[PDB]
């Protein structure tokens, strides 16, 4: 059994559909009449990745309520964001966004990272379409990818057609390289990301034309909203030697320190 972690599917209300895949549907509810959660109805794999959101808690990760994993379909319930994807609450002009906030922004997701590489969890789709923000505009990182099991297969989201290219070092583009060092690289990106409110990286680009450019040495562009100090930091994240990125404890100090001058 999950113990602590079983819901009592009664306790639930259901209120508005959030999302909707071929595999799976979130729809935003309350649990015993006083918390908002979204839930999250779909197999095997599904489970073994709520185990491991089991194992995971801090204050910048979506967290995990509960499961429901005796009738079907099977449901997980985390805690509800109410200003939803952070990639399109970045998109909306009408929150006229200033700098400072943008920063924050930053320091959220990297607070997250810092936990994740602390606990050796290696996230590897990190990016702003993969983050949520509450309805205090606090952003919060989801331990898996939002599409999984709503609409692609544990087979099919980052695999081939649908790989995060754009968030991807060297290293991982031509020999699937994975480490603590391309989870730096995206975190770089998703900086951009934020600073340029929703672009999308090399947004002029095919993923192939992004491929050969970054093996070339390419980098993004420093957004007219981020200052040297700020870009310095994302930029620190692209060197094209994987062990000369910082980790995520001198990076959050890095973001912390520029905080403090501007
Ligand atoms: C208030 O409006 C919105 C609220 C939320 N909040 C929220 N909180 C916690 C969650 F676990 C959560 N999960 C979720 C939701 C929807 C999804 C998915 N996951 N997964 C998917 O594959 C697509 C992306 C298909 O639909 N959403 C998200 C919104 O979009 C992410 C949104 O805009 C619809």
Not at 121 to 135: E, G, M, P, T
Request: charged share 25%.
């Amino acid at each position: 059994g999950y113990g602590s972690w079983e819901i009592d599917p009664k306790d639930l209300t259901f209120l508005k559909e959030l999302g909707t895949g071929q595999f799976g549907v979130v729809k935003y509810g309350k649990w015993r009449g006083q918390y908002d959660v979204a839930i999250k109805m779909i197999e095997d794999e599904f489970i073994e990745e709520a185990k491991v959101m089991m194992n995971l808690s801090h204050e910048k990760l979506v967290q995990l309520y509960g499961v429901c994993t005796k009738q079907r379909p099977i449901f997980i319930i985390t805690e509800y964001m109410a200003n939803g994807c952070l990639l399109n609450y970045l998109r909306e002009m009408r929150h006229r966004f200033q700098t400072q906030q943008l920063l924050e922004m930053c320091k959220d997701v990297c607070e997250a990272m810092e936990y994740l590489e602390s606990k050796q969890f290696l996230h590897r789709d990190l990016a702003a379409r993969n983050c949520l923000v509450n309805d205090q505009g606090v952003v919060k990182v989801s331990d898996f990818g939002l599409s999984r099991y709503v609409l692609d297969d544990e087979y099919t989201s980052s695999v081939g057609s649908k790989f995060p290219v754009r968030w991807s070092p060297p290293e991982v583009l031509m020999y699937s390289k994975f480490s603590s060092k391309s989870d730096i690289w995206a975190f770089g990106v998703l900086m951009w990301e934020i600073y340029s409110l929703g672009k999308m990286p090399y947004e002029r680009f095919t993923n192939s034309e992004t491929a050969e450019h970054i093996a070339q040495g390419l980098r993004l562009y420093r957004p007219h909203l981020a200052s040297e100090k700020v870009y310095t930091i994302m930029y620190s994240c692209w060197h094209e030697k994987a062990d000369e990125r910082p980790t995520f404890k001198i990076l959050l100090s890095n973001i912390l320190d520029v905080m403090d001058e501007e």
